[PDB]
Amino acid sequence: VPTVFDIYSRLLKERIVFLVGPVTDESANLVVAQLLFLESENPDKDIFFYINSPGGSVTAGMSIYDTMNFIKPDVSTLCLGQAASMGAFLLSAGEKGKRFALPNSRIMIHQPLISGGLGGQASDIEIHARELLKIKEKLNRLMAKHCDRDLADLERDTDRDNFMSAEEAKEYGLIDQILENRA
Amino acid sequence: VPTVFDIYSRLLKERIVFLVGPVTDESANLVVAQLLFLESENPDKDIFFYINSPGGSVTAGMSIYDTMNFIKPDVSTLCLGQAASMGAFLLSAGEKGKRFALPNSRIMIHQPLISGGLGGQASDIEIHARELLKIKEKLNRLMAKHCDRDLADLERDTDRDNFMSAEEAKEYGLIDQILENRAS
Amino acid sequence: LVPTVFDIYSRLLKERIVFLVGPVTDESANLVVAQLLFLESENPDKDIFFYINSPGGSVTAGMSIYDTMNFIKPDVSTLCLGQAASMGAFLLSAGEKGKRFALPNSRIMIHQPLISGGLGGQASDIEIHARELLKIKEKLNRLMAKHCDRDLADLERDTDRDNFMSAEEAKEYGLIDQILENRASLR
Amino acid sequence: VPTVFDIYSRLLKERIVFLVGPVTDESANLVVAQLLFLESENPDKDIFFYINSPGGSVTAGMSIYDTMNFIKPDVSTLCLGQAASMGAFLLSAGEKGKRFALPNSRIMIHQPLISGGLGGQASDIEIHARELLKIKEKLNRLMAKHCDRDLADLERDTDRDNFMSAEEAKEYGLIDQILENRASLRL
Amino acid sequence: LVPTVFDIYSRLLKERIVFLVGPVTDESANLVVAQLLFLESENPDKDIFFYINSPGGSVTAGMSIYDTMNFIKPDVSTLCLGQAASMGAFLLSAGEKGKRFALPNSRIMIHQPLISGGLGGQASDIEIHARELLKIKEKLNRLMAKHCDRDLADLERDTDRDNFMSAEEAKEYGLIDQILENRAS
Amino acid sequence: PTVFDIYSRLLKERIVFLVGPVTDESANLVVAQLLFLESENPDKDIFFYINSPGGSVTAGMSIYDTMNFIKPDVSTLCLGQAASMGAFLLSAGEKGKRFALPNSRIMIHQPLISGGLGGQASDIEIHARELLKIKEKLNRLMAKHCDRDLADLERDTDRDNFMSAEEAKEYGLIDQILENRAS
Amino acid sequence: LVPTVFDIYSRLLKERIVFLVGPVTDESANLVVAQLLFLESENPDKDIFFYINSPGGSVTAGMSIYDTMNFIKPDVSTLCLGQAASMGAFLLSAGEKGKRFALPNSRIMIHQPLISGGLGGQASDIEIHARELLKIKEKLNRLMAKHCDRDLADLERDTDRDNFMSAEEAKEYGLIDQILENRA
Amino acid sequence: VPTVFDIYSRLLKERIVFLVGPVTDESANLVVAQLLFLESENPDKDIFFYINSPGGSVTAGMSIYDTMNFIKPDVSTLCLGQAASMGAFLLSAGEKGKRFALPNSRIMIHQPLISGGLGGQASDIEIHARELLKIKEKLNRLMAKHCDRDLADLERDTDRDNFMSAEEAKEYGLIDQILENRAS
Amino acid sequence: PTVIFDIYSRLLKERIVFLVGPVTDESANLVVAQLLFLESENPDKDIFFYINSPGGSVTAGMSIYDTMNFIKPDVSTLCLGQAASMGAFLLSAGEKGKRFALPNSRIMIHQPLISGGLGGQASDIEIHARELLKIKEKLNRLMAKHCDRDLADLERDTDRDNFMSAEEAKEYGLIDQILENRA
Amino acid sequence: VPTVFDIYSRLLKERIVFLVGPVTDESANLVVAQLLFLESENPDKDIFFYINSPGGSVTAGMSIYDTMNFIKPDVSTLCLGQAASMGAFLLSAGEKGKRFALPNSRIMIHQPLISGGLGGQASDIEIHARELLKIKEKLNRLMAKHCDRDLADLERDTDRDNFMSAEEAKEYGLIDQILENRA
Amino acid sequence: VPTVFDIYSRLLKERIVFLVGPVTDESANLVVAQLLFLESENPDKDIFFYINSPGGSVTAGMSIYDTMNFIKPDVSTLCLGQAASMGAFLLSAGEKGKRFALPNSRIMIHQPLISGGLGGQASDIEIHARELLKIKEKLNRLMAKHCDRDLADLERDTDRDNFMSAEEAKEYGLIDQILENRA
C-alpha cells in the first residue's frame, strides 16, 4: 500500500470509507471505526461509503448498518464492481437520495444461505431454523423499506439470486442514481 | 469370518440374523435380504434378530423395521452389547413378548441428531427442518406404541441421551425379558 | 461380507427380486439392467420385483434402468423400502401401474435436477450445458407427470424444491398404488 | 488498518474499547490492557466497551469481566452485530444503566458447551464433569444477577440456544436501552 | 457384488451380450476386445449385441475396440442405454449399419478431442504433439462422417463444442438407425 | 494357512481366539463362534484363547453375557496378554477353568475415554454419569469373578495394575498357570 | 522486497504512474481505484499513466477500475508492458483514446468469459447464472467493440476462443493507438 | 496492538508484566527480560505480575520462578482468568502477602503431565522416569512451602486435577487476598 | 502359489511353520494356531519353526514362546536371514540340541526398546517404567537360561545392540549348530 | 534487510539494479520500477543491471526488455552466478559494448519450455501451440540480433540446453567482456 | 517484544545476552553477533550470557564457544530453566569463577545423538561415523577441561542422559556458584 500517510488513510481525509471483498467481523468493524472516526472529526459532513463486496456475515453487516443509522452524518453509498447480498443491503441503506452506482456496477440480492451446515439435535435445529426465518423476514422488511417497495415484492424477488444492472437497481428503488462522471 | 460355509451363514441356518455396528443402507438391506430368505424357507418359524448397534441412518433402519412387520414370521429381538438410537428402535420393534436383552446390555434412546449439516438457502433449510420435526414425532409415536407408553413420556424421555440398563429397559416397556442363560 | 445359503442376493434373484441400494451410479445401474435382462431371459412371462432404497444418483444411469424396465416383457413391479429419493423416486413411479408399492414408513422425495460439482469452461460451453440441463428438467417433469397421472404444471410446482412424502401422500400424489403393511394377503 | 495513531488507537483516546470476534486469551487480555490503561489515564470517566462477538473462552471472558468490575471507571457496553455466549455475558455485565444495543443486534445465551474433548480415566472425567456443572451454575447465578432475575429463570432460558432481539434483551434485563441514534438515550 | 446364476455378466455373455459401461480405459477396452474375440470364436456368424453406457475415455483404447469390431466376422450391433458420449458415441455409431439402436431416453453427445491435464515439455515437443492431436481430430471427424453418412464439413461444424442429442436427433443425424421402445421394431 | 483355514480347523476342536483390540466386529465374531459351538454340542467345554489389550466395553459385554448365557462351560486361557476388557473376559471363564500361560501379562484398571466428551454440559453430565455407572458395574462384577471385595477392586484399578500369572492367580483372576499339559 | 528512495512505487506515483500487475482481484483492483482517486484529488487536470502487465481476473473487480477510469476528470492513459490479457486487455483498451500504448514486445489477448471452478446448485439457480454470464459476455463485447471502434459482430467472432495479438496487430485492431519504441 | 509507545509497553511503565497463554521458552524468557528490566530501572519498587495461563513447560516456568526470587523487588502476583499448573505455581510464588486473584479466577493444581512420549531403550526410560519423580517431588515441596501446608497435603491434593475458586485458593494458602475492586 | 493347498499349507504337512517379518499379535497368533494344529495332528513328532524376523511386540512373542514350551512336540528352530530381538529370543527358545542357524544368518540381541512413548501423568509413567524394568529383567533371566549363562552375562551383553554371526551365536549358547547343508 | 536505508536501496543510489532468482511478474515489475526511477533521477547516466537468474516468465521478461530499450540511459548488464534462459536473454540485451560477466559466471540458452501443460480442446491447444512457436521464433530472432549471429545459428544452438562459460558467451556474441576485477 | 528499543536491545545495554531454546545456525550466530558487538562497545567489561536451552546443532554451538573464548571480555554464564547438552557445554564454558545457576536450574549432559539418520553408501556411512566419534571424543575432552575432571570420568558420565541439580553441577565442576538472589 503506497504512501503519499498511506493511500487509504489519505482518502479517509476526504471522508472516503471503503468496503471491499467479503464482509467479516474484522472488515466490518474497521468500517465501523472509520465511521465513528469521521463523525468525531466532523459530525455534520457527509460520509462517502464505497462498496465493492459479494456480501458475507449477516451480523457483521448489521453492525455496519446500525452504525450508518446511529451516527449523525449522512452516509452516502457508492457501488463499484459489485454489491451482492449484504453488500447490496448496505448499498441500499445509504441516506436516501445519496445512494449511487457506477454504470457497469453489478447488484445482486437473494435470501440468506447457510454455507456449511446445521448440526445438532432436532430441538437445536428447530431453534436455529426459526431464527433463520426471522433473519430472512427481518432482512426482507428492512430491504423493502429501503427500496420503498412492498414486503411481498422483496420476498418474491429474493427467492433465488436476482441480478440487477445499475438501472434495474435504480428502477427497483435500491439506489437513487447512476454516476457516469462528476457531471 | 471362519469356515465351518462362513460362521454367519451357518447361524442363518438356525434363523439367526445379526445387526452389528452402524445402520447403513448396505448393512440394513443385508438384514432385509436375510429376513426375506428366512421367510421364504419357512414363513411360520420365528426369526432371531440379534442386535449390537449404536444406530445410524433412520431410513435404513425403517427398511428393516417395515420388513420385520411385513413378513409372516415373528421376529424375536435380542440385545447384546448395546442397542442405541435406531438400534434400540429395532430392538423395541421385535414381536411383543419376544423382545429380549442379555443382563449387561446397554440400551439408549434419544431424539434425532444430524451429524454434519443443513446447507443451502433458508427455504431448503426450512423444508428439511420441518421434515426433521416430522421424523422426530413419528419416531416418538412409534416408540410409545412399542413401549405401551404415552407419547408425552417418550417426548420427555428422548430430549437428551437416555441410557438404560436391561432392567430399566424392561420396566420402560422396551423389552419383555432379561435372559441370563437358556435356563428360563 | 455376504451370507451364503448361492450368496443371499443371488438366492433372492431366484425369486425375481432385484435390488437397487444406495447411490445410483453407472455400475450400480447396469448391474440392475443385467438382472432385469437375465430374469426376462429366464422367464418373460413372470413379474419382476424391483426393490428400491436409494437417494438417487446419476440421471443417465437412472435412465438406463428406466428404459430397460419399459423395454422388457415382464412387468417390473416396484417396492420402496427405506427411501426413494430423486432418481430413486422416479424409478419407483415408473413401475408397472398397479404394481407400485411402498412399505408404511418409506420416505419418497422428488425435486428438480441439481448439479454436483460444477460447470467450468467458456461461457459458450456453459450456455450449452445449461440449455441441456433445462431439457432434462423438462423431460423428467413430463415423464413424472405421466407416471403420476397428474398435469405437468403440478409437477413443475411440486419439484421446485425438495418435496418429502410419506407413503400415503405418495399414494395420493399418484407415485405409488399401494401401501403394504404385512404379508397376510393375496396368494 | 487506516492511520489518522492508527484508527483504533485513535478511538481509544475517546475511551472506546472493542471486542470483535472470538474471545481468546490474547484478544481478552488486549481488552484488559486497554481498560487498565484508560483507568490510569482517568479513573473517573466512563469507558465505552463496544462488543461484537460470538463468545469464546470462558476463562478469557472472565478476565475481562473481573477487570470491568475491578477498575474505578464505569464500563458502559454497547452491542453491535452480535453478542452471543461469553459476548452476551460481557454485554450484560456493563455498569447497570449503561448497557446498550444497536437496533438490529443479535443476542444469544446458552449453557456451556465444550467440544474437542474430555479424555482420560473415569476419575478424571468425574472431576471435570463436576467442575463443568460448577461453571454452568456460576454463570447462571452471575447472569441472573446481571438480568435481575431468579436463578431458575436463567437455568430454564439457557438450556438450549436462546436468541434475543435487542427489544427482548431489554425486556429480559440483559441490557438497559436500545439506541437507534444519539437522540435515543432516555431514562 | 455380482450375483450368480455363472456370474450375471458371464451368463449374459452366453447370449452374446457385451457391455461397455463407464469410462473407456485400456483395461475396460481390452476386456471388450477379449469378449468380442471369444464370441467370434464360439460362433463367427451370429450377431453380437454391444451395449454401450459410457461418457467416453481413452482414444487409443476406444480405437482398439473399434478396429476389433470391424476386424471380426460377426456383425456387431450396438445399443445405447443411458448415454453414449464422446468415444462412447463413436463406438455406438460404429455398429454394423442397420443394427444401431438406442432406448428412447438415451443421451448422445459428440465433440472434438479434449486433452489430458496438460502437455508439458520443450516447444519442439509441444509442436509434435499438437500436430498429432490435429491429425487425431480430423481422423475421427472423417470416420464419424462415414458412420453417419454425412459430410466431413458437417462433423467438423457439429463437434466444435459439446453437442447433445436425443435418440431421435441422433437418428436424424445418422448416428444410429432406430430407437427401440420395446421388443417390437 | 489353509488346512479350511487354520482357525476353522481349530474351531472343530472347540478353540475360539480373541486376538487384538476388542471391537464390535471382533467381539461379535467371537459371539457367533460360541453360539455355533453350543449348537454343535451344548455340553462340551469351549476353549477361549485370549491375547488382547481390551477395547470397547459394550463389545466386550456381548462376549461376557454370551459366555454366561450358553450351556457349555467356557474355559479361558491367557497367552501373551489380557488387559482391561481382555482381563475381564479372562477372569470371566468358568470358575476352575481359567488359565494363563506362564509368561502372560495381565493388567486391570478403571475405564478410560479416548478422544473426548463433546457437547452441552447437560449431555456431558449424562455421559459422565453413565461412565461412572460402568466403572462401578465392572468393579462389582470383577469382585465377583475374583472372589474379592468391591473395595479392593476399586482400590486396585485406580491406575494401571500389571500382574504376573502368579499374581493373577493369587488375586483370584485365574485358577491355574499352565506351563505344559502335565499340571 | 521493495526499495525505498518513500518506497519505489509511491515514488513513481508522484509522477502519476499507477501499476496493475498480475491477477486482477478485488483488492488489487481497489488499490488501483484508490490511486486513481488520489491522483485526481492531487491534480484533477493532469494525465494519469496506467501501466498494465496482467493476465486478467475478476470481471466485477475490473469494472470498478474501468468505471473509475471513466468517472474521474484526468485522462487515464494506458501502457502495456509484458502482457495485457482478458480483463487486462479490456482495461488497456479503455484508456483515453489517443493515449493507449504498448511496448514493442507486448502480448495482448482477448476472449469470452471463462468460469472459474464450477456451477453448483439447482437447475433453476443454474439457469439464472447462465443467463447472467451471457449478459456479461454480450456487455463485454459491446464495450470492447466501442473501445476498438469496431462492429459488435467482429468482437463476437474474434473472442470466441483465445485471440493473441502482437503490438502491431493490437494497433491495427484498434485496441491501442501507438507502439512506443524509445523515449526520444 | 494499540499505540498510546504500544499498550503493553505502556503498562510496563507502571511495572505491570503479563504472562498470558501457554508457558513456553520464548514466552517465559520475555517475562524474565521484563523482570530484569524493571529491577534495573528501579530495584526498590514492587513489580506486578499479572497471570492468565494454563501452564506449560516446567523448565520455562522455573526460569521465571528463579528470576522472581532472585531480583531485589517484590514480585506481586495477580491471577486473572486462570492460573493452572505452572501458572498456579507462579501465582503462588509471588511475594508472601502480595499474591492476589480476581473473584472469578480459576485455579488448578496437579502432578506433572507429559506431552508426547518417553521413547528409547529401557535404560533411558528408567533415567527419565527417575528424573520425573524428582521433578514431581521438588514441585510438591516448593508448592507446600508456598502454601504453608504439609508436603503430605500437596502430594495427596495434586494426584489428579484439583480445581479451586479464588476463595478456595486463599483458604488453601495459594494466594493471600481476593480483590473485587480497588478497595479490597 | 497352489500345489497338488497354498505353498505354506503344503509345507505345514512337513511340520514347517514360519515366522517372517515383525512379530505382531496377528502374526504371532497365526504361528500359535499352527503349533496347536500340528500338535493335534501328531503330538509326538518334531515341529520345525523357521525364523526370519527383526522381532516386535514382546507380549505377542511371549504368546509364541509359552506355546512352544506348552505343547508336547519338540520345537526345533532354524534361523534364516535374521533373528533379532524377540526373533533371537524365540530362536534361542527352540528345544535344546535342536536350535539351528544357516551360515549367513544375522542374530542380534538387546534390551527392550519403546518407540512411541510414555505420556500422561507422572504416576502412570512410574507404573509403566516399573513394568518395563520387570520385562527387561525377566527377558534377561530367560535368555540366560536359554543360553546356559548367568544373568550378569546377559545384562552386560544386551545393554546395546549386540550383533552375532551364526558362529558367535553358537559360542554364546544361543543356538546349537550351524547347518551348511543337509549333512 | 541490513540497514545503512536497506542495503539494496543504498546500492540503488549507485544506480545498481538486481535481478535475482526466478523472473516473475512482481520481480520483473520491481526491476521496471527501478529502471524508470533511475531514469527520472538522471536520464543520461548509465544504469548497472546485475543479473543472477535461471529465467522465468517470458512476458515478465519482455516487460524488462522493452523497458531497457525504451528509457534514455544505457543499461549495462553484468552476469554473476548465472544467467539462464530469460536471464541470459536480458544479459544479452544490455547496451552493446556494456554487457559483462564475472569469470565463473554460467550462461545457458534454450528454446521455450512449458511448465505444466496445454489442457483444453484441440482447437484451444492448436491456438496456444501456434503462439508458442511464434514466441520461439521471436526469441531466436531477437537473440540473433543481440548476438550479431544468424537466425539459423540460434535455432540450432537452442534446440536443447546450451551451457556456456563466460569466455564462450563472449565468443558467441552474447556479452562483450569478462571482468576479473575493476582493473 | 515490548518497547522501552525492544526489551532485548535494552538489556544488551547492560551487556546481557540470551540463548533461549534450540541452538541453530541462526540463533547461534545472533549470539555471536552480540558478543562481538558488546566487545566492540567495551572490550574490558564482563558480558553476562544467560542460558536457557536444551542444546541443538553441535557446529552452531561451537561457533558460540570459540567466540566466547576469542573475545577479550570475560563471558560469565548463568543457567535459568535448563542447560542441556550443548546448552550445558556452553554454560560450563563460561569464564572460570563466573559460571552460575539459579537454584531450580536443570542441567543435563550426554553423548552426541544424531538427528534423522545416516543414509548412503557404506563408505559414506563409515566416514560420518568416524567423524561422529571424533566429535564425541573432542566434546568429552573439552568438557573434562571445563570441569577440571578426568577425561575418563566424562566418558563414563555422558554415556546416557545425566541429569544434575544446580548443586550436583557445582560439585561436578560444571559451574562455580548457585545464586539464590543478588546477595
Ligand SMILES: [K+]
Ligand atoms: K446517519
Ligand SMILES: [K+]
Ligand atoms: K413379523
Ligand SMILES: [K+]
Ligand atoms: K415392462
Ligand SMILES: [K+]
Ligand atoms: K467498574
Ligand SMILES: [K+]
Ligand atoms: K464385424
Ligand SMILES: [K+]
Ligand atoms: K457357559
Ligand SMILES: [K+]
Ligand atoms: K477519465
Ligand SMILES: [K+]
Ligand atoms: K524478589
Ligand SMILES: [K+]
Ligand atoms: K514343546
Ligand SMILES: [K+]
Ligand atoms: K536504454
Ligand SMILES: [K+]
Ligand atoms: K573471553
